[PDB]
């Protein structure tokens, strides 16, 4: 058996971490590139896929803040606010 855990490198080259530190809700990269799906980095961005319509990027601090930022509502996945799809 071959152990592939080839690690993640921050898009800014500042650190190399295992992929278990990617979206682990703690900021490990100065550019925020290890936490695209959480609110952990102060300078990160969350991608609103908005399937079928124009995609948007929001501040990471708006992920699970209880406010509906993406028209698809995907920024609110564990906050208690259930967002409706308003892309149309």
Binding residues for Ca ion (CB under 5 A): 21, 24, 26, 28, 34, 62, 65, 67, 69, 75
* Residue 17 or 53 with smaller CB distance to Ca ion: 17
* 28 annotated to a ligand binding site: yes
User: Is 53 a known ligand-binding residue?
Assistant: no
Identify which of 24, 20, 25, 45 has the alpha carbon closest to the alpha carbon of residue 33: 45
Task: Work out how close the CB of 1 gets to Ca ion at its nearest, in angstroms, rounded to a whole number.
Answer: 27
CB of 24: closest distance to Ca ion in angstroms? 4
The DSSP code sequence of 20-79 is: GGTTSSS--STTSTT-TTSS--TT-EEEE--TTS--EEEEGGGTTSSS--STT-TT-SSS
Distance, CA of 26 to CA of 42 (rounded, Å): 11
12 is known to lie in a ligand binding site: no
Q: Which residues are annotated as a binding site for Ca(2+)?
A: 21, 24, 26, 28, 34-35, 62, 65, 67, 69, 75-76
């Amino acid at each position: 058996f071959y152990e592939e855990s080839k690690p993640f490198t921050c898009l800014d080259g500042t650190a190399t971490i295992p992929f278990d530190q990617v979206n682990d809700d703690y900021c490990d990269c100065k550019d925020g590139s290890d936490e695209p799906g959480t609110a952990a980095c102060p300078n990160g961005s969350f991608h609103c896929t908005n399937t079928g319509y124009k995609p948007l990027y929001i501040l990471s601090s708006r992920v699970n803040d209880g406010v509906c930022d993406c028209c698809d509502g995907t920024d609110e996945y564990n906050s208690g606010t259930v967002c409706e799809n308003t892309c149309r």
